[PDB]
Structure formats: C-alpha cells, structure tokens
Amino acid sequence: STIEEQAKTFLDKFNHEAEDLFYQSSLASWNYNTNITEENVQNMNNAGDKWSAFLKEQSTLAQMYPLQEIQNLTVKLQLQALQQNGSSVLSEDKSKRLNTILNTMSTIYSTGKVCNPDNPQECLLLEPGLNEIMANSLDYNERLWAWESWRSEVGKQLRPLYEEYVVLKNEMARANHYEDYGDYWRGDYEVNGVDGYDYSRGQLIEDVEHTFEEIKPLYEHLHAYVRAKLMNAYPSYISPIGCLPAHLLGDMWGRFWTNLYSLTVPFGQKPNIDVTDAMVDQAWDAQRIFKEAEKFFVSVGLPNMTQGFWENSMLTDPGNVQKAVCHPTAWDLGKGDFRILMCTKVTMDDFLTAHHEMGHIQYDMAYAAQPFLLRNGANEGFHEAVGEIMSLSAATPKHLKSIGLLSPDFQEDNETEINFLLKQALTIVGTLPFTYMLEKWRWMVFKGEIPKDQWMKKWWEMKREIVGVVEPVPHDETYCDPASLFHVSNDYSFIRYYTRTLYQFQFQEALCQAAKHEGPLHKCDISNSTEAGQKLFNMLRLGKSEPWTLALENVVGAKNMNVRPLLNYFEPLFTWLKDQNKNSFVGWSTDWSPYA
C-alpha cells in the first residue's frame, strides 16, 4: 500500500491511543485543582510522566510520513501539527540552560519583595501588595514608590537573563527554520494550500497596523478626557498637552484602566445598573444562576447539558478542611465528560462569568465529533471569542428584565449608556495600543532591528509617542521593564489579545442582523432567534478541520480581520467624547516630563 493509507492507519491508532491516556491526566488535574493535598501531587507527576513520555514517542516515529505524497488537506493539517519537534531539536547541553532560565524567571517573578528605603519593618510584595494599593491611592510618592522598587529589583535581576533568553529563543526557532522566533510565533495564524483563504506570516503586522490607525481619534479623545479629568484629583504635575505618567493609569503596567472610573465619571449622582440586590433579596441558590445560563443556551440555538456536569462539577466554595483553588475554568476531560471549576457567591459578576463558562463548555463539546488532534479552536483567540459575546447579551437591560431581576418598571435614561460605555471601554479599548506595542517590541527584539543596548530607550520613547506615557523618573539602560511582566517573564505571547478583541465584536454584529434587533449596537441581545443559534452552530462545530479565515467568513463574511464592528459599538461614546473635548486641545506632546 502507498504512504497515504499507512499514514491514515497511524493517525487512527494515535487517535485511539491518546484518548484513554489523556483522560487519567485530566482526572488527576481535576482532583488536584479541586482537592489540594500532598498525596494528590504524585498523580500529577505520575500523569505528567506517562502522557508526556508517550507524547514524545508519537513525535519520534511520525516524521517518516512526508507531506509531499499526500493529497488530502485534513490529514496534511493533522501531520503538520504532529510533525513539529518542539524543544528536542536543541541539544541537551543547550536545552539545560533554556529550562534553567525559565525556572529562574518563574521563581523570581513569583518571589516578590518590595520595601520602602530606610524602613526594613514593613513590606508588601505582589499580592495582597502592589496591585491592591496603587489602584486606590492619591499619594504621588506612594504611587511612584512601588512603581520604582519593583522595576529596580526585578528589572535589574532579570535583564541579563533576558538578554540570553532572546538569543536562545531565536536560535531554537531558527533550528526549525521559520526565520526566527518572531516568525515562530507569527506562524500560528498560517494557512496554506487553500485558495481564497491562504495567508502569509508577514502580513499580520501590516494588517494589525491598518486596524490600529482607524481607532486613533477615539484613543486621542479619551487620552485628553482622562488627562483633563485627572487634573482635578491631582491638581498639577500633568502636562497641558503631553504624556500621562505611568503611575496614574490603574495597574502597574498601564495595561488595564478599570481603576480610573472612581475619579472619572461622565454623569455623577446616578448609580449604575445593579441586580445583585434583587438576587440577594429573594435568595437564589448557587444553581439557578447556572440554570438561567443553561436556559439561555437552551432557548437560543443549543441543546441542554448532560447529567455528568450536574454531579461531577464543584459549584460552591467548599471551605472546611478540603482546600479548593478558585479559578473559574471549563474542563473537557474526555469520553463525554464536561465540568466547571469555580466557586460562586451571589454576585452579578458570577452571573456574567457563568455565561462565559457555559459557552466554553458548549464550544468544547461542539467539536467532539472531530478527531482527537482537531479538538481545538481555530486559533488561540477564537476560543475566548465564543463565550465572551454572552456577557454582551447577558448585560443588556432587557434579558435581566425578562428573567425578573431588574425592576420591570425601570426607565433607561440617556445618562447611563455613556457611563457604561466608558466603563467597558476602559477595559477593551484602553489595552489594545499598549499590548500591541509590547508585541511589536518583542517582535523587533527577536527579529534583529534593535541591538541589545538601545532596548529601554526605544521602549521608553514608544511609551511616549504611541501610548502617551511619560517617565516619572529617567531610567537608565540597567533595568528591564518587560522582564517584570507576567507573560514576558514566563514564555507566553500577546497577539491573542488583539484579534480576539476584534473577533468578539465581528461575530456579534452578524447575529444582530439574525436577531431582527433594532436600536444601538450595545443593546443587541440575541433571543428567540433560532437562526442566529443555527449560524453559531455552523461555525462552532467545524473547529480546526477548516481554516480560521473560513470560520470567520462563515459568520461575518470577511476573509480578513476588520475593526468596523468595534467602532459601530462606539458611536454614542464617540459623540459624547467629542462633545466635552472642545475646550481643550486633543493629543499629546512627547517633550514634557515630570523631571523636565
């Protein structure tokens, strides 16, 4: 027989043999993440041995089936995923330093100790330290204090290791012949061999800049808005036209702006929408929240849950002597086993999170008919683009009224809409520029444009001309601000946070026509439209058997990412922002400085 059917036989054997092995690992993982104890740690190791070892052997014998002599697309895609080496292309001597640097970075990032100078009595570290304090504090020195201490310790003790890590990752990627580590990560979005759907690895950067340029007026308007509104709480130390400081933008790294609504309220004296009071008065249990999350998916387009999730999933915090780590996640153990790991209180945040988790569960089972190696989302971003749109439909003041939580006699005023839009734009809109700038810095570091010497200077002046952030203290080239980051100290990417941001809005607008809905886009709530659920099913059940561009086009009709839905979400906010920015100049000047 020819190589094609032999490869098919090996594929079938692998698909059968991986399932039972993965199930025990998943069971051990659920047991640990539900019940923490010393004796339930060998199982991890035990599982983390067996499965892991098996995996490497299935990459050892899988390279003798060349893809050139196969004419079926799906098995070609399968072989591409399983023919990758990983880190075994590196020799053992050079592989004993990569893992060493990873261990050092993880340990040092987890090990935090921030103390004030000349005061060895009190220290506060990471949590419940830095994040809690410098989000609600109106003291200049206190805000700039932990800001400088964390960078002076972690940056100093991780910059030399970062220098070695960059070149090591470049070498390990070049051993796999992509061009370098940058193309190594940018090849995740690769599709070849399909007409009208193929895509190149280098076009990602330019395509991202295209959607980046079509949001700059909004970013500049909100920049001037927040600067003018923080000129009130902080009387001075702010340029009339310039870069906002790095210690006045919510979190440490400025990547989240949720901590700025306290000082910046569009219309005051008006409480927002709160249904948690209704939840606590008439006393729903921990279940009915999930049952309503269940009945939403039941009603729209999707079948109801199986019996296994209702007797094998922990919903409420156990406390007691049995410890459980609260981290809401969706678990697909295999063999038709689905559960959710989370601890719930009576909160609206848990109400919104339950919809996200249920969407994740219904997404996992959607591609359960696909082979074992095709049981995943189209990329690393579509998976969060499926269950997150539920929070867009679970927060409208029509489904809450329908389920009996929000005051059926309420009148929705012109004042609350802009407040909600600013509140939820401080999270989604306010993180794209910094995140993509960080990714661009990583890409140019890995590609080779910037030598190791002019690293922070370029970083700090991109902090000025792109984000609009000024140094509270002039830093020298001895720190490493990126090294003190969660997904930079530990090996993870940042591109997934950008396309996802545009995916969640692109799909929604499609269903907004399928729901026959009229009104503003933010009020678009899908309900009683089996057609929208049918289209959702027509894209969830495919998975990795088809290119991601095809999956996107099946709903939105576009072979490339578009930003227009995001701005179509923000017409009232844009109008209101330009409504109260007519007395001060918009933009920033990258010449002002707190230190002059």
């Binding site: 032999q6 059968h16 038709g336």
Partner: protein, 198 residues
C-alpha cells in the same frame, strides 16, 4: 414475546421485517441469538446497510435481515474504577466480513510493504484493543449490552410457536368452540364412552 414487549426497561428495542406484537404468534424452524457488549455510540451502527468498524470488521448485518435487535445500557456492570479492559474489538482486517461471519485471529497487520514477522512497531500494529470503561464516562461511551434475534424458517416442522391463549368452557348450551385446532359448533355434554389412552 411478553416479558420483552411489556417490560419498559429497554433503551432500544426495534424489530425489522416483523411487528413486535400481532406477528408475535407466527413461528419458524430455528431461533438464533447473538449477544455482545459495545460502547454507547456504536448501537447506532447495528442495522442493515450500515458502514463503520463495528458494522464491517466486527459483525456484518445483511441488507435483507429479518429479526429484532435489543440494546440497553450496562454502565452499572461493565464499569470499573481501574478500567474495563476485558472487552476487545478489532481495527485491522484485510477484508470486510460477510454476514454472520466472525474472525478471532491476532495477526499483526502488514500495513507497510515489509513482513511484520509477528512483532508490532513501525507500520506493524496489534489488531485488537480494549474499551477500558470507566464509571465517569458519558452515555456516548458507556457500555451497552446488545442482542440480535434472528428467525430461520425452512421446509421444516417449525416447532417453536409461542404461547396459546385459552378460555374457560361451558356446557349444556350450544356454542362455537376451537378444541385444539378443531372448529365446531353445538352442545358439549358429559359422556361415558371409553377412549383409549392415545
């Protein structure tokens, strides 16, 4: 055919070629029962004109099959904490099976172009493997006991003909009667003749 039809303890009970009742008092030369255990999702494959591993390389059903099929869950028996590795099933066979044909060989498949020499490896694999049923598995993988019943009729006496219903008898009044296949009409009266024992 009464402890089967009336008892609603069966997930799947379907008769092809005959009705459950009505045709439950017609008889044939022989009855053949095939019993086995499969996974929850394979019970669909047991039908005439079906393709798949179970329908082809394990047991083939003829297109003109006449009989009945019963299939019911057995998760309370064939599920073990350590895994139910006892049940074996086949992947690697050179040709499809004929109806009512079985193969129980353990020949290593010569998938490649070189003799396997009886040892598994590259392009050489074991043909039979196990479910490993677990208590926490879903209905799509939970074990199901399946039995198929086939009726064979030939130029034979066909001596398996079901139960016969009977009614009480009255006397001294002419009626219709069916005495052991003898149809008649009239009065039945006590007698005193001497019939031979046969």
């Amino acid at each position: 055919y009464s402890v089967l039809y009336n008892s609603a303890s069966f997930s799947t009970f379907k008769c092809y070629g005959v009705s459950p009742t009505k045709l439950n008092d017609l008889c044939f030369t022989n009855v053949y029962a095939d019993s086995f255990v499969i996974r929850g999702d394979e019970v669909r494959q047991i039908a005439p004109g079906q393709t798949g591993n179970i329908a082809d390389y394990n047991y083939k059903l003829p297109d003109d099959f006449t009989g009945c099929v019963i299939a019911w869950n057995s998760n309370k028996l064939d599920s073990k904490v350590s895994g139910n590795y006892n049940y074996l099933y086949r992947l690697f066979r050179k040709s499809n099976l004929k109806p009512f044909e079985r193969d129980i060989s353990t020949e290593i498949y010569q998938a490649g172009n070189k003799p396997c020499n009886g040892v598994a490896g590259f392009n050489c694999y074991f043909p039979l493997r196990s479910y490993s049923f677990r208590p926490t598995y879903g209905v799509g993988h939970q074990p199901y006991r399946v039995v198929v019943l086939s009726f064979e009729l030939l130029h034979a006496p066909a001596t398996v003909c079901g139960p016969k219903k009977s009614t009480n008898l009255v006397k001294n009044k002419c009626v219709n009667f069916n005495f052991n296949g003898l149809k008649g009409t009239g009065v039945l009266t006590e007698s005193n003749k001497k019939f031979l024992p046969f």
